[PDB]
């Protein structure tokens with residue numbers, strides 16, 4: 001060890017960060033009167049309805 | 059008019075010319091939202107700053 005033959009110095013680093021996300025929301029707060037389309041074998045009713053409103057410009 | 063008219067019924071419209079009152083009170087509101095994100099970060103390092111005499115080769 002007379003010289004710096006044994007003198008040693010070293011550093012090392014490794015950092016990793018990963019992220020991920022997702023969202024999906026929906027809301028509906030109306031009331032619509034529909035009409036029966038047909039009666040199924042079990043008695044369930046197929047209902048279809050439509051409502052058109054022309055407030056102004058569309 | 060010679061038609062029959064009930065006494066105790068609510069006088070609902072029954073024929074072509076009958077008139078009815080409609081209260082609109084319409085209120086519809088629908089909303090929809092969605093989001094997504096993805097972040098990846100990495101950063102690596104390595105350094106001696108001092109190398110032993112026996113390791114100077116590499």
Ligand SMILES: CCCCCCCCCCCCCCCC(=O)O[C@H](CCCCCCCCCCC)CC(=O)N[C@H]1[C@@H](OP(=O)(O)O)O[C@H](CO[C@@H]2O[C@H](CO)[C@@H](OP(=O)(O)O)[C@H](OC(=O)C[C@@H](CCCCCCCCCCC)OC(=O)CCCCCCCCCCCCC)[C@H]2NC(=O)C[C@@H](CCCCCCCCCCC)OC(=O)CCCCCCCCCCC)[C@@H](O)[C@@H]1OC(=O)C[C@H](O)CCCCCCCCCCC
Pocket residue numbers: 112113114115116
């Ligand atoms: C998943 C695991 C799978 C297994 C993987 C296997 C290993 C997968 C491979 C890992 C090793 C990387 C290979 C690097 C060399 C190489 O091939 O790929 C190079 C390109 C890179 C591609 C790599 C992509 C991989 C892709 C990734 C793949 C990963 C999988 C090409 C090249 O060759 N470029 C080359 C060129 O550049 P240029 O182009 O510009 O011309 O020339 C210049 C100048 O040459 C120098 O000149 C000096 C004087 O000037 C002279 O010194 P002097 O004494 O004479 O004065 C000096 O001589 C000397 O070292 C003198 C002497 C030093 C002895 C000191 C004691 C050290 C002991 C150290 C002990 C090591 C302990 C592990 O030697 C040696 O005995 C070396 C030790 C051999 C150990 C054998 C392992 C036994 C198992 C021991 C097992 C231990 C059990 C516990 C001269 N050095 C040379 O020639 C170069 C070479 C000479 C080869 C002849 C020796 C016998 C080889 C014999 C066989 C080797 C075969 C592999 O040595 C090496 O490093 C070889 C390292 C091998 C380690 C493998 C471990 C296997 C584990 C086994 C595991 C299964 C070089 O700088 C440059 O190389 C360099 O920079 C390299 C740099 O230094 C060192 C950085 C290392 C950091 C880690 C990598 C980090 C990289 C990470 C990012 C990708």
Ligand SMILES: O=C(O)[C@H]1C[C@@H](O)[C@@H](O)[C@@H]([C@H](O)CO)O1
Pocket residue numbers: none
């Ligand atoms: O005993 C040896 O082998 C040495 C001692 C140091 O001086 C070393 O560095 C080397 C030098 O390179 C000679 O010129 O000689």
